[PDB]
Nucleic acid binder design. Structure first.
Ligand SMILES: [Mg+2]
Ligand SMILES: [Mg+2]
Ligand SMILES: [Zn+2]
Lengths: 81, 49, 246
RNA sequence: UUGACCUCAAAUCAGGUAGGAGUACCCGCUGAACUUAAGCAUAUCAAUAAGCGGAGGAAAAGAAACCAACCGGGAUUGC
RNA sequence: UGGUGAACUAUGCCUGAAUAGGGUGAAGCCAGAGGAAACUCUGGUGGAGGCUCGUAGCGGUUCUGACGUGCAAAUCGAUCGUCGAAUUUGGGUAUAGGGGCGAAAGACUAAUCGAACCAUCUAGUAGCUGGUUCCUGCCGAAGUUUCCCUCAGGAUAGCAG
RNA sequence: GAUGGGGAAGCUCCGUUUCAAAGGCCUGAUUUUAUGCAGGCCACCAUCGAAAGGGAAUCCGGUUAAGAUUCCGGAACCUGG
RNA sequence: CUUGUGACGGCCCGUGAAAAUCCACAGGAAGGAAUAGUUUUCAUGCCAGGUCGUACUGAUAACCGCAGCAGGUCUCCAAGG
RNA sequence: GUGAUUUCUGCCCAGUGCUCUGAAUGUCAAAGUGAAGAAAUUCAACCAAGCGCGGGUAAACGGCGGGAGUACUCUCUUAAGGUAGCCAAAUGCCUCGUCAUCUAAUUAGUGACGCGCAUGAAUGGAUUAACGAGAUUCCCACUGUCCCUAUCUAC
RNA sequence: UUUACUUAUUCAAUGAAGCGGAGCUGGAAUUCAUUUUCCACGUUCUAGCAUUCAAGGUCCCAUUCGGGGCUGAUCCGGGUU
RNA sequence: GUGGCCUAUCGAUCCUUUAGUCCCUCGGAAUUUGAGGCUAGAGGUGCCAGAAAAGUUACCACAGGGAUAACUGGCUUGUGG
């Protein structure tokens, strides 16, 4: 009974939500996220996972400060009014 | 090369234990048969004469 | 081939010793000043059972000579020690059972136990139940003592090493048959995970050197060289002789 | 006793700086096998892919412990 | 090559929990009797055992029953093994892929195991199988020679344009 | 599972009291006063880990379409000050 | 009958957690009364008790098995013959 | 490794392993030493462990035959040749072995026999109470398994 | 080419507490002139107790509430052993 | 008369080595060792136009094959009848 009766015993999560990415990939016993690598300082990325890099790279979010850097450069980082 | 090993592992030993261990390892029979082979080496010359 | 069972034992994942119900390391009192210039008197408060150990332990209380407090040491109980007995530890201690005299100050034929190898490691030799060390001879110049160990070996150790006079309590245990796989289960359940033992000749050849074949047999000789490597040392390692002697 | 020197510390001491992201191109380390040899082990793939460390608008290199053998040339880079 | 899994399951640890009613009647003890003494006998008491019949529970022997495009990628029915422990089990925790764990079947490691899964190298290689897209006109074969780890393949000569 | 350390080219690995100068505790004293200087005490030595282990203290009656040992009425208890 | 508990008895080469936390004792540091104090482990009296969860199912239809699947999934209460 | 108890575990160290505190130039690396050379280099001596020589070891892996003579003895092979036990056994080709028993009839079962293709002693041998969803034979009871089929209910 | 040495290196313990040398004070000791040495150098019927820079002695201070130094508890070398 | 009366009686590249020329080269210039070349032999591939090479799989896998076995059918009929 490795199929249907064994699927009834599944009610204990191995992963919960992660703090940096909100992914539900944070392993409870390992205390590590399997997608972004929290709590390591570097973010988990691999050159074989180029599509995953495309999924989580810069520009897939809000760019709350980086949207204005090109415009401030074009104006020359001016000050005043 | 043999004398290093006796200093390494047989420094603290007495002759009762030494005789017991060589009798249990069978080297004493080899020493006996080597001296015996010397005895028939002399003895065959004596029988020839 | 796979990694064999005795090869897997050294990682210590499930092969660590079960130490939940143990009462502390049974060591001798440290050799400070009193034990090497005079003696010191302590008291046996209780004799207790140690989990996973065949011998009982003794909880001996001394007074700290430098601070107002009490020290509690765990000794291995000698056969004949009772609760409320005064235990004397030191160079000038009288020769009675339970006292912790150094080996330089006991005569010929003395039976001691919990013997230090070097002076100060707080007990190494003759600690299992019913075992003892006999003093075989002294050597004052180059101050050493010869001792007979429970294995029958004769060691030459320092005369400043200490030992508890008498034999370890709880002797004669292994004379009783266990009679039951349940009894062996409860015996090893508090020691470590080394039981039950599957024979390697009953395995598959991926799992052991002895495994495989259309009959259960070893194949090559079971005597293994000392220069063999891990994964090969399964059998009788470096056997000088085999068989039942008569 | 007092005052130096040397060395080593402590401060939510005064002021600073490093980490992470990106990584097409750049500077290094580490490092395969599929494949080809009509098999295969040196070889090849390849001083490559994957992995790790570190920069900039370029980086690196760069003003000879050079090339030459000629009636000698003259930093580096690229075609 | 680099990562992800012990939510199933294997094993150890830590902390909890669960297990009707019967049968047999072990030590210890009490009374009576006998004996010269050792000690024996009889009647009770007591309630031991990896004992036994048998529920809940755990498992899965047979019908090679049902079903077999099923209720179900392993179930249903009857018959069964076991049922106070080497028992069953929750949660926490540890062990990760030539590695783990195994009362040992090459078993189990998320329906995947005589080496898991994911992505990349990778459009891996194939003397082997299958396919290969409009018309008309003209010419029109070979299965033979020699060499090859050659015998389902090539080179070379021949035949053809 | 950090730190002190020690490996590792490195991502990181070991170790958890270790070859560390590892800290805070009460009385107060002073009443330019702030909290130093009077003192004296103590050496564990991060932290995480149980909604079934340990653990301060609440019960009854009534009430809603849907909440209650939590609201209402009454009657208690514990902790800190 | 279910359950709680007490005093016992049997078993073991099995003798069947730890820490936070609270109390007591030993000790005698120090502070202390006579026109006055000393005591808040006695009684009464005063104030405050933050944050998050709290509905419902828990299974032949609320979970997992592609589903409103005869499967699987821990536990408490338990009337009469 | 073997697998409760009882009773035993015979012979063989030649081979393959394992193991010696034996004896010591046969094999004999790099470094080092010596000679020749102008030097690169060449040639020798010396030379650690391990091999090689000498012992031990079968509850180590394993093995347990022939040929003669005459139960016995002597030879070979290769060390020793199957001891105590057990058997057409789950191990016996021939084989449906031979004898007895069981039946009307038995390639099945059981008890014996043993030149056993190719049984055999911790590769464990023989025996064994109790136990077994283990394999096999016979007997009593019992029955639609069958002679030989018929009928009824629910879906 | 054979033996010792300690500071390199290595192992172990401790909250780095009693190391080494010398000296007292006793005992043995035979001294052949005066001491050569060697052992010791506060604890053993009893499941109590042992802590407040220590009492005492002594010397200062400015007496008072007390405070400090030496000794009690032998010197010397800072090599934790 | 350019071996055996005739028809069989044998071997590439790379590497090593020998003989000859004592000839050519070691590329800044020479001498001498050393090395590399040219011409002709030898060391050998017997699977003989010339890979360096043990098994097992009843746990097995892939690409194919009726070019190829283990049924039936078909031809044959020794053998059988
Ligand atoms: Mg186990
Ligand atoms: Mg085998
Ligand atoms: Zn994350």
């Amino acid at each position: 009974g490795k199929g249907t009766p064994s699927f009834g015993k599944r009610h204990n999560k191995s992963h919960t939500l992660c703090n940096r990415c909100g992914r539900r990939s944070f392993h409870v016993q390992k205390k590590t996220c399997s997608s972004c690598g929290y709590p390591a300082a570097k973010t988990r990325s691999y050159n074989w996972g180029a599509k995953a890099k495309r999924r989580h790279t810069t520009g897939t979010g809000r760019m709350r400060y980086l949207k204005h850097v090109s415009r401030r450069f074009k104006n020359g980082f001016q000050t005043g009014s | 090369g043999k004398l290093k090993k006796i200093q390494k592992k047989y420094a603290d030993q007495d002759e009762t234990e030494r005789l017991l261990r060589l009798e249990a390892l069978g080297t004493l029979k080899g020493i006996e048969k080597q001296q015996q082979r010397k005895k028939e080496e002399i003895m065959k010359r004596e029988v020839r004469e | 081939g796979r990694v064999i069972r005795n090869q897997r034992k050294g990682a210590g994942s499930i092969f660590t010793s079960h130490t939940r119900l143990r009462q502390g390391a049974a060591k001798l009192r440290t050799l400070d000043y009193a034990e090497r210039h005079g003696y010191i008197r302590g008291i046996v408060k209780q004799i207790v059972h140690d989990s996973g150990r065949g011998a009982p332990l003794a909880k001996v209380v001394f007074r700290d000579p430098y601070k107002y407090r009490l020290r509690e040491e765990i000794f291995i109980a000698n056969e004949g020690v009772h609760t409320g007995q005064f235990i004397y530890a030191g160079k000038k201690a009288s020769l009675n059972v339970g006292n912790v005299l150094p080996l330089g100050s006991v005569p010929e034929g003395t039976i001691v136990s919990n013997v230090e190898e070097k002076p100060g490691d707080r007990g190494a030799l003759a600690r299992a139940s019913g075992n003892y060390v006999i003093i075989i001879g002294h050597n004052p110049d180059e101050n050493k003592t010869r001792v007979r160990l429970p294995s029958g070996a004769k060691k030459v150790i320092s005369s400043d090493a200490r030992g508890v006079i008498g034999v370890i309590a709880g002797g004669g245990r292994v004379d009783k048959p266990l009679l039951k796989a349940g009894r062996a289960f409860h015996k090893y359940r508090l020691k470590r995970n080394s039981w039950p033992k599957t024979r390697g000749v009953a395995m598959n050849p991926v799992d052991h050197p002895h495994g495989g074949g259309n009959h259960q047999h070893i194949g090559k000789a079971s005597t293994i060289s000392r220069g063999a490597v891990s994964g090969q040392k399964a059998g009788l390692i470096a056997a000088r002789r085999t068989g039942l002697l008569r």
